Amino acid sequence: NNYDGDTVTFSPTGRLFQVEYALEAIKQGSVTVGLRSNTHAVLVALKRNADELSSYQKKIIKCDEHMGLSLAGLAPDARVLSNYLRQQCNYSSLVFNRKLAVERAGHLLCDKAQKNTQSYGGRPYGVGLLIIGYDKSGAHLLEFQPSGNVTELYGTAIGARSQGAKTYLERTLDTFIKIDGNPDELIKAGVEAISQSLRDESLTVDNLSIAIVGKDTPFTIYDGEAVAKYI
Amino acid sequence: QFNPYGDNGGTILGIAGEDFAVLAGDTRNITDYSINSRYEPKVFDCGDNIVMSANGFAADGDALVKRFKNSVKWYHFDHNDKKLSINSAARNIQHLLYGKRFFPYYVHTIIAGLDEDGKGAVYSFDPVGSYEREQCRAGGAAASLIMPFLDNQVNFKNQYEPGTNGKVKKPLKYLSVEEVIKLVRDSFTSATERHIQVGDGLEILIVTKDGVRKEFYELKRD
Amino acid sequence: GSRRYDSRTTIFSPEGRLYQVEYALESISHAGTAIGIMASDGIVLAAERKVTSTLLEQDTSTEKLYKLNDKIAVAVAGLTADAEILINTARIHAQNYLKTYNEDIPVEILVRRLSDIKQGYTQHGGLRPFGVSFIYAGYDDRYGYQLYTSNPSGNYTGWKAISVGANTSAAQTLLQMDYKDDMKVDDAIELALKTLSKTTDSSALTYDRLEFATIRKGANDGEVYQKIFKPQEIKDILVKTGIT
Amino acid sequence: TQQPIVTGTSVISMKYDNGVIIAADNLGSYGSLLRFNGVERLIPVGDNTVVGISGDISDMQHIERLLKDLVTENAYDNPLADAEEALEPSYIFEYLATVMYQRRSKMNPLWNAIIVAGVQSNGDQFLRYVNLLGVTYSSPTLATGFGAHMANPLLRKVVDRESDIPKTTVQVAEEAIVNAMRVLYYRDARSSRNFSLAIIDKNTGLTFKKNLQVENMKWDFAKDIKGYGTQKI
Amino acid sequence: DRGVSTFSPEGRLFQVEYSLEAIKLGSTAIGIATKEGVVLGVEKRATSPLLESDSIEKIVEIDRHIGCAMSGLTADARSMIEHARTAAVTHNLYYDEDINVESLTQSVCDLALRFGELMSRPFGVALLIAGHDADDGYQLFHAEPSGTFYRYNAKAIGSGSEGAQAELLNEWHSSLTLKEAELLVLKILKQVMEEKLDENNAQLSCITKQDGFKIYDNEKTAELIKELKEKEAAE
Amino acid sequence: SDPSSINGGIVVAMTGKDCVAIACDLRLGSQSLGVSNKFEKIFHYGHVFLGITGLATDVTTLNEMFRYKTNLYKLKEERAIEPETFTQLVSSSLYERRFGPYFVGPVVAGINSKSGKPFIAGFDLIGCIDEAKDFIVSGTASDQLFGMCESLYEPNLEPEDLFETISQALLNAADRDALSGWGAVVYIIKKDEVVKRYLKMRQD
Amino acid sequence: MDIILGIRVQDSVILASSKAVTRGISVLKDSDDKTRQLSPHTLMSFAGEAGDTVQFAEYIQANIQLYSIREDYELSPQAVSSFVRQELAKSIRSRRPYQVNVLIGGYDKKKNKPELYQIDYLGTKVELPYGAHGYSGFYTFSLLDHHYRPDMTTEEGLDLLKLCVQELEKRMPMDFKGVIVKIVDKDGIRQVDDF
Amino acid sequence: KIKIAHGTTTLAFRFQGGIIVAVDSRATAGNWVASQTVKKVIEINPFLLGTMAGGAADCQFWETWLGSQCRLHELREKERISVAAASKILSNLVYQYKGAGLSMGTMICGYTRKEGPTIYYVDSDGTRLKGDIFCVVSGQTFAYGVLDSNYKWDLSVEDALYLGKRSILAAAHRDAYSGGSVNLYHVTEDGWIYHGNHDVGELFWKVKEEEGSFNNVIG
Amino acid sequence: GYDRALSIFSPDGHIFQVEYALEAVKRGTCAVGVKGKNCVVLGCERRSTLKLQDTRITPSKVSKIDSHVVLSFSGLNADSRILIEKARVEAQSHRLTLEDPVTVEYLTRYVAGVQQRYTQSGGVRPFGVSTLIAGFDPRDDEPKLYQTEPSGIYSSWSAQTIGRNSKTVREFLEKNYDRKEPPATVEECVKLTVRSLLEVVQTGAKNIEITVVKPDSDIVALSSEEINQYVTQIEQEKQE
Ligand SMILES: [Mg+2]
Ligand SMILES: [Mg+2]
Secondary structure, X not given: OOOOOOOOOOOOOXXXXXXXXXXXXXXXXXXXXXXXOOOEEEEXXXXXXXXXXXXXXXXXXXXXXOEEEEEEEOHHHHHHHXXXXXXXXXXXXXXXXXXXXXXXXXXXXXXXXXXXXXOOOOOOOOXXXXXXXXXXXXXXXXXXXXXXXXXEEOEEEEOOOHHHHHHHHHHHHHHHOOOOOOHHHHHHHHHXXXXXXXXXXXXXXXXXXXXXXXXXXXXXXXXXXXXXXXX | OOOOOOOOOOEEEEEEOOOOEEEEEEOOEEEOOEEEEOOOOOOEXXXXXXXXXXXXXXXXXXXXXXXXXXXXXXXXXXXXXXXXXXXXXXXXXXXXXXXXXXXOOOEEEEEEEEOOOOOEEEEEEOOOOOEEXXXXXEEEOOHXXXXXHHHHHOOOOOOEOOOOOOXXXXXXXXXXXXXXXXXXXXXXXXXXXXXXXXXXXXXEEEEEOOEEEEEEEEOOOO | OOXXXXXXXXXXXXXXXXXXXXXXXXXXXXXXXXXXXXXXOEEEEEEEOOOOOOOOOOOOOOOOEEEOOOOEEXXXXXXXXXXXXXXXXXXXXXXXXXXXXXXXOXXXXXXHHHHHHHHHHHHEXXXXXXXXXXXXXXXXXXXXXXXXXXXXXXXXXXXOEEEEOOOHHHHHHHHHHHOOOOOOHHHHHHHHHHHHHHHOOOOOOOHHHEEEEEEEEEEOOOEEXXXXXXXXXXXXXXXXXXXX | OOOOOEEEOOEEEXXXXXXXXXXXXXXXXXXXXXXXXXXXXXXXXXXXXXXXXXXXXXXXXXXXXXXXXXXXXXXXXXXXXXXXXOOOHHHHHHHHHHHHHHHHHOOOOOOEEEEEEEEOOOOOEEEEEEEOOOOEEEOOEEEOOHHHHXXXXXXXXXXXXXXXXXXXXXXXXXXXXXXXXXXXXXXXXXXXXXXXXXXXXXXXXXXXXXXXXXXXXXXXXXXXXXXOOOOOO | OOOOOOEOOOOXXXXXXXXXXXXXXXXXXXXXXXXXXXXXXXXXXXXXXXXXXXXXXXXXXXXXXXXXXXXXXXXXXXXXXXXXXXXXXXXXXXXXOOOOHHHHHHHHHOOOOOEOOOEOOOOOEEEEEEEEXXXXXXXXXXXXXXXXXXXXXXXXXXXXXXXXXXXXXXXXXXXXXXXXXXXXXXXXXHHHXXXXXXXXXEEEEEEEOOOEEEEOOHHHHHHHXXXXXXXXXXX | OOHHXXXXXXXXXXXXXXXXXXXXXXXXXXXXXXXXXXXXXXEEEOOEEEEEEEOHHHHHHHHHHHHHHHHHHHHHHOXXXXXXXXXHHHHHHHHOOOOOOXXXXXXXXXXXXXXXXXXXXXXXXXXXXXXXXXXXXXXXXXXXXXHHHHXXXXXXXXXXXXXXXXHHHHHHHHOOOOOOXXXXXXXXXXXXXXXXXXXXXXXX | OOOEEEXXXXXXXXXXXXXXXXXXXXXXXXXXXXXXXEEOOXXXXXXXXXXXXXXXXXXXXXXXXXXXXXXXXXXXXXXXXHHHHHXXXXXXXXXXXXXXXXXXXXXXXXXXXXXXXXEOOOOOEEEOOEEEEOOHHHHHHHHHHHHOOOOOOHHHXXXXXXXXXXXXXXXXXXXXXXXXXXXXXXXXXXXXXXX | OOOOEEOOOEEEEEEOXXXXXXXXXXEEEOOEEEEOOOOOEEEEEOOEEEEOOEEHHHHHHHXXXXXXXXXXXXXXXXXXXXXXXXXXXXXXXXXXXXXXXXXXEEEEEEEEOOOEEEEEEEEOOOOEEEOXXXXXXXXXXXXXXXXXXXXXXXXXXXXXXXXXXXXXXXXXXXXXXXXXXXXXXXXXXXXEEEEEEEEHHHHXXXXXXXXXXXXXXXX | OOOOOOOOOOOOOXXXXXXXXXXXXXXXXXXXXXXXXXXXXXEEEOOOOOOOEOOOOOOOXXXXXXXXXXXXXXXXXXXXXXXXXXXXXXXHHHHHHHOOOOOHHHHHHHHHHHHHHOOOOOOEXXXXXXXXXXXXXXXXXXXXXXXXXXXXXXXXXXXXXXXXXXXXXXXXXXXXXXXXOOOOOHHHHHHHHHHHHHOOOOOOOOOEEEEEEEOXXXXXXXXXXXXXXXXXXXHHHHOO
């Protein structure tokens, strides 16, 4: 109200309204699902078009051979944060000959987002990220909020109507976690999860974006006729 | 005073065929009169069907190759996974090298691959990023021993048609990968005999439309 | 953060005026009247000290008339402290020019420099402008005797006669009435004092309430002399012109 | 640019069937003065890596602190710091190699020759060299300074190529190392009789041996050597 | 007052949303992508008859293979064009090749959100970036001050956009010829323009693989306008 | 190569009874080649006289610098700078270039306008003050000037006697220096009159 | 090494400049003009280190041309010479000093007097009736010291210069490939047609 | 040295038909012949040619850069850059780097209707000179043309090409560091035209036989 | 440093500081540009509220940027000096690097670029100035007339006016200026420029300044009497 003019101001109840408004930009964003087994981690994203002449806005960004994320909210903010992850993944490889742990990637994103919430002049990031990766401790899924809060999960969803996909995954938890050494079945579970967040529109060939990373699978994005198999 | 440069010896050879390219190097690493390693690889697969060697000061060579490999990774990120053509790689490596024009990478760089018409390509660089597309280039210690031989046995220089008394040059024939590898092996065998820094092993990376494959041959260990 | 407290000293009004320049000009309108009159054979600077005291040391006092170099003087209307900052900058500019070209700075070049500094404070920096209007009296071998004025906007103009500070409307009408082009310094001295004597908000114009200066080629042959009048010399010229 | 002041001589190392051995004498020389004898130049990093350092001792003590800080840093927000996300030899080497090449590239080197000996997560032997120039190389045997000239020839008679590594036991490897340290004591003027030896085995882990001495030395033949040519007495 | 980088309670940046209003007041620009090339057309909208219309430059070359049309505060576009030209040429210097149209557009869009308390405000101009590269053929992009860029088979920006876009929705198909696209841009420009469309108040351009980016002569456009009038009178 | 002996030239200053004298040669050269015979090395800021020997570009630069500084001084102080105060200003100004100095041998001469006391001072190139009662010497013939002054000088000379002494000191010193001569100027300075005399001398 | 001579006569200033550009034993040009017009009544000739001479000369030209436009006035040759000297004097204690020697020939329209300024690379300035930079200096000085009269006409000054160049051609080891001559008077700056 | 340097055989001359540019193709590190097939003519753009003498890298890198700066000028000003302007971009750039150890002696050749056929010689010293003819033979730059100084302004394009080719042959024979092949370029208002690669080995015997020259050499 | 964003967007997509800068221009004395067949004429209003003015030394309204290009303006006089100085520096910088004087279009594009920069840089306000930039490109006889405004947009004009009552004199020019036949001579062009100002000025005395720019750096400012003869002839033809 009087306390939402900048990110440096607490409200009388100890809330940061600029951060809460940034969090709102994510809810307006198109739905994206993350889920993993013990062998593979999968991103599924519903891409959003401007109109019938326009392309569908790309949602999934590759960060390294073993790590990448899906975005919901301000796409340029995802580009800045994903670029930062690309550099941190790259620094780890060049200096230490070491693939960056997904958990440490989460800690780095948290700390970068935090600095924008405690300084004058800046603004919070207006995007939410689902980071998947396969490192030395197996498959990982992270959820990033521009508050700085990063959370390790078996599955989740962010964006408009994400609650439908999240409830489904909460039911299926015991089933999809056990889908080991079967990439196609894990993606099916992700496509079935994101389907709980659709209204009026359905998954078409230029609508659906899928990414997968796993034990002997580099981070690869599937778009166009490569996802027709799953429609 | 402190000298930031050294000589790790070694010799490299790039030959461009009609529809293939080979980049070969000895696997010996030396300082002065000592052998550091008999097998320290010098020729690297950088991705996008490009093989690279930066011969001379091994530290500068490792640094340049590392930076170029990283350049390929970021080219993919920045340009929607577009394949880096050998000519674009060559121009990129010039900028990497010329960036240190006043404190150079003390290396002779050769890259091999296929051009955009699928024909064999070799690019040769000086330490400060001067570069040329070539069919044949030896670099390193035994370069002066190898290049005259290649001039004669690849380009058929100073060879004429018998009975023409030098009026008809010996006609240039397209060399197969098998004949080029014979010339590479004989080049290094000869260099190993006459150059004290050359020996131990020969690693050849062959580039075709099918990708990069690796052949290794032992050299004399004296 | 800090934005809350920013007055924004360098913004246009909806009418396309610079608030702080307009308010600075309001400030200057309350400052003691300064008059410059340019004659064929020299320039007169006359200025009124603001409601003085009997205990003020007048002979060592300077609030109105300042020397920039041997050829150029200024009359001040506004904040004296603000004027001294600019005066010291102008004195350095004159010596910089003299060092570079081995020639005394032409009057306009000095005026344009000081005016450009004032301008800068109205367009960037977020600082208040200088609450100062200058009358520049100067001589160079290009244009001869010159009168200029500059105001907090950093606008400057040339004049045959001009007033700054209090009652400029009244002062300018009186100058416009009695000024002629063939006028001489001695006549200009009389005009300047007669104008102040009629426009002053004080009961009577006395020596202790005036600063006076003349720039004359009344220097022996082909050179120019600046004369900052002493209290006794101002008292004498007041009697001579028949005001006291 | 500087000059080394207090210096350590040869570090020697080799691969055997199940791991790596590395050794270095306990001397810090001050030019021709053998000033410090209780100097440890093998610095273990966890239970899988030993870093053997020759050259400037002040620079070695700096590198020792970097490695100590590396272990602390790795443990930060790392629940698997003592498991899957523990420091590997390869990580510790690549870090040192980065620092060494950067320091030479600012014309302010760390005046050292470093051998990183260890065993990787998958049980693979790790043995790689880096020096003040940022030059790096791997071999079944590695040695710095005099060790390169005198130890390598002896160690290469045991493991001459990669295929000899599975045929080399820890007893034969250690024996060859200990013999090489005796030869270096005979022929190196900046060497010492007291040395440390570290074994990193993929089964028995890190065994660190301190206060080892060169023994079984041959001197008796000296008594028969008289004069420099003609002298018979 | 309030931060320049402030979010609204709906999770939108005030200044970005406000710049989008400035672009709505801009003169109309239309792009149509075909397999034979991309056409770019603009309404010049001279404020007076004494203004020499050929000096109105709302269609601009970035490189031989990339053209650009603008709508909104067109002065804001100059530094964006400068960056685009520098990015295109710099990439050619570093890589001895043409830069991908998407990579050029992405480079321009990276400037967009570089504002705060960097430039004091977002750009008040939208760009239609049209070009050809070997990888993705003929392409049309819409670069917004939000830093978002959409690819379009056809797109209209400026005052007459929502009317023009609805018209492009009906008219565009994947088999359009370059000639058909030219007439289509002229037709929709003529529909949404206040003044009557002629060769002096409207400007055409195209990008083909063979000839690269070309701004059409007034004589060449005049013929296409006459061709349009006759074919509309033909039924 | 030595910056202080490229262009050549000398300055000498002497005190007399209620007067000071400062004198200089007129030569400017490029080593062996004489270039100008009109290169005066004595300048004045009000009643304070400054002679400068050494690198000619620095002589010209320091003159312009002290004109600049004494002009500002006068505007602010509302009075002409005095010899004692100027000496400190020359010292300060030279020492601020301690590690990149002007290659000059400055000499100050003048009468304090209030006390009437004759004043002279010399400086090394980094501003160390030599405040001699008798005489100050500077330039490529400083050894010759020291010799001449030490024998010719006596205290409390009348202005017209001091003129002869300083003139004979300069002329005979300059004639034993390759890089000095080509004419000479002498300033006889009294409390409120200064006479300037150009001397006839050999032109080789 | 190069030849730049200046002579100031009664009513004008004449500058004669060697046409040769030589780097080592290589002759790069034989038609080189070592002059820039600073203002309509001011001419500067320059000799010295390669690149620096033209870079300095052109930089001065731009600055004097800038002053001309701003004040709609032509700076006096004295003022231009003082500006040029100061720029040279900055260079000597700079990171990489300009090695440029110049002659400034100008006609002062206020005083109706020709003026010649000699400034060396250190910013050493003198006003002379005649001046020269380089090896040719000492010879020409002795000749000009004998022949020069201050009431000389432009044609008399030209004849005297022509004698200098003739004598310099004979006595100099290098070939300077002739001179360009330019006259600076009240009417402006003109290149002597034949010399 | 480590850096490939070229001190020999670059020729550029102005004539009735535009500019002829002739270079050799030999690269030498000391007495070692590194290559017989290097390009000593840099194609800045279709209308601008640069000759490589001095540092091979220094010439390649900064004349490729000059083509980039020329392209920007044409986008911004919608006009071909003048040879005077293009040459001064490069000359002003190397002058910034002066004393750092750049080595470059280059002839910038272009034909515009404003200027006509124009050659500028640009130096790492910061020298920029306009001239009718420039040649570089064993680290020495000359404005006279290797053979007869006069040659002809009124010279056929065929004849002018031959003179340039024959001039490189004269240098290639006598100069140890000059050889390999001759590369010929003809610069017109509408752009430059490549006139091919001629091996000096085959050229020498043919010229000797046809001209009757090189009597001293036995063949 | 002072970084405050003074030029920002309002909810209706307007930049008020840029629009308020245009109000400063509206308050400025009238300036008019008319290009003939072989000339351009810059006419400027001098408000007669200031008499006792020294016209010898008072800043003239038309400024030479180079020997071939002139700049007149409407709005804040102090603001105009900063644009004039930058333009004059750029004109010499262009001659130094390109070895050719600026084209009128290039000089306009630079000045307009400076104006634009000051509308999205922190801690600065826009220039309260619009400019008329007239002259001839080197070795070209085609007349050039451009207009710039605080936003930084610029364009070419057959004839244009800026400042107070510019609406009225533009009205005049729009009915009196034929494009097919521009003022063929200097006389005709000056006459049409004086006529256009007489719609707004008041007295045709010292209130009208005229500067004629012809090809090949031929720029001259008309005197009081020369302009007074145009003023006399115009009204004597009007009495009919
Ligand atoms: Mg061998
Ligand atoms: Mg003498």
